[PDB]
């Protein structure tokens, strides 16, 4: 704070000897920024890829469902009922799951993973037992699935059960 009244000769000296930052001819933000340096893949990300590959390899029936915002009590109750029929509920992030399907046999399942999605898997294709559990909540849709490495829609699962 300039409490004391500086002499005008001194005041001019302060004004003339002011810092002048260098100004580039072209603003740096306007220039094309260099590509971001690459980083190392997250160890959890590569752990999911190994886990995801096991899911598609061990079990043959995979059911793609949208993880609706059901209450935790209702969502756990459905999971237990599916467990009685040995139906698991696998959930993986799409940012790791989509690239896995981009380089894989199941490359046509990419549009099915849009939003909150969950995977229902089982060693034995117990389609008929799974459908009746899903019929309890009319607002839980079955987007599609893949049985014996064959891509099918919800209608096929109804035909497969019958």
Partner 1 sequence: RGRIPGRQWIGKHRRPRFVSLRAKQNMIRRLEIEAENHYWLSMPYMTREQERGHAAVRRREAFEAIKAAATSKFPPHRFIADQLDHLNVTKKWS
Partner RNA sequence: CCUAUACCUUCUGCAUAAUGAAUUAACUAGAAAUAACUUUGCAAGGAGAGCCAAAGCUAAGACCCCCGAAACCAGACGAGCUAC
Partner RNA sequence: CUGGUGAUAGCUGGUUGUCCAAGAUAGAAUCUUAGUUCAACUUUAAAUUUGCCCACAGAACCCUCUAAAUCCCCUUGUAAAUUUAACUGUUAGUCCAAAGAGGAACAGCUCUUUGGACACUAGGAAAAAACCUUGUAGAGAGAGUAAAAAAUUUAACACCCAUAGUAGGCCUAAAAGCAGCCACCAAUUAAGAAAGCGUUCAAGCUCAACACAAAAAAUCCCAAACAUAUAACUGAACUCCU
Partner RNA sequence: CGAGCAGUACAUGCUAAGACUUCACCAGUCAAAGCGAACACUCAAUUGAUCCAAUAACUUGACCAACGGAACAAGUUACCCUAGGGACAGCGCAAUCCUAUUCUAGAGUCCAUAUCAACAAUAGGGUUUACGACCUCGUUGGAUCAGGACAUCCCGAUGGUGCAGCCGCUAUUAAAGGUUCGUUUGUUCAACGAUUAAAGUCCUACGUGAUCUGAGUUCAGACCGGAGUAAUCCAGGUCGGUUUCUAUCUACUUUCAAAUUCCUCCCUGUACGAAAGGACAAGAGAAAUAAGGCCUACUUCACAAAGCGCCUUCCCCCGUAAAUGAUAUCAUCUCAACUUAGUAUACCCACACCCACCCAAGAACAGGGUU
Is residue 54 a contact point for partner 1 (CB under 8 A)? no
Nearer to partner 1, 3 or 23 (CB): 3
CB of 34 to ligand FES, least distance (A): 15
Tell which positions 94-123 bind RNA, by CB under 7 A.
94-95, 115-118
Tell which residue, 116, 118, 142, has the closest CA to residue 131: 142
14-43 residues in contact with ligand FES (CB under 6 A) are: 29-30
Q: What is the 3-state secondary structure (H, E, C) of the chain?
A: CCCCCCCHHHHHHHHHCCCCCCCCCCCCCCCCCCCCCCCCCCHHHHHHHHHHHHHHHHCCEEEEEECCCCCHHHHHHHHHHHHHCCCEEECCCHHHHHHHHHCCCCHHHHHHCCCCEEEEEECCCCHHHHHHHHCCCCCCCEEEEEECCEEEEHHHHHHHHC
23 near RNA, judged by CB under 7 A: no
Q: How far is the CB of 29 from ligand FES (least distance, A)?
A: 5
Q: Which partner in ligand FES, RNA, partner 1, none is near 13 (CB below 5 to 8 A by kind)? A: partner 1
Asked whether position 16 contacts partner 1 by CB under 8 A, the answer is yes
Which of residues 16 and 26 has its CB atom nearest to partner 1 in the complex? 16
72 binds ligand FES (CB under 6 A): no
Give the whole-angstrom CA distance, residue 144 versus residue 115: 14
**Contact residues for ligand FES (CB under 6 A)?**
29-30
**Residue ranges that bind partner 1, judged by CB under 8 A:** 5, 8, 11-13, 15-16
């Amino acid at each position: 704070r300039h409490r004391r009244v500086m002499h005008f000769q001194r005041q001019k000296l302060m004004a003339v000897t002011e810092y002048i930052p260098p100004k580039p001819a072209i603003h740096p933000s306007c220039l094309p920024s260099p590509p971001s340096p690459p980083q190392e893949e997250i160890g959890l990300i590569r752990l999911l890829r190994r886990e995801i590959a096991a899911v598609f390899q061990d079990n043959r029936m995979i059911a793609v469902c949208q993880n609706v915002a059901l209450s935790a009590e209702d969502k756990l109750l459905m999971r237990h009922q599916l467990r009685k029929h040995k139906i698991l509920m696998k959930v993986f992030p799409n940012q790791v799951l989509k690239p896995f399907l981009e380089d894989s046999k199941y490359q046509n399942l990419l549009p099915l993973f849009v939003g909150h999605n969950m995977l229902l898997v089982s060693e034995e294709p117990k389609v008929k037992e799974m459908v009746r559990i899903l019929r309890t909540v009319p607002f839980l849709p079955l987007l599609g699935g893949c049985i014996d490495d064959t891509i099918l829609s919800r209608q096929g699962f109804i035909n497969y059960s019958k």
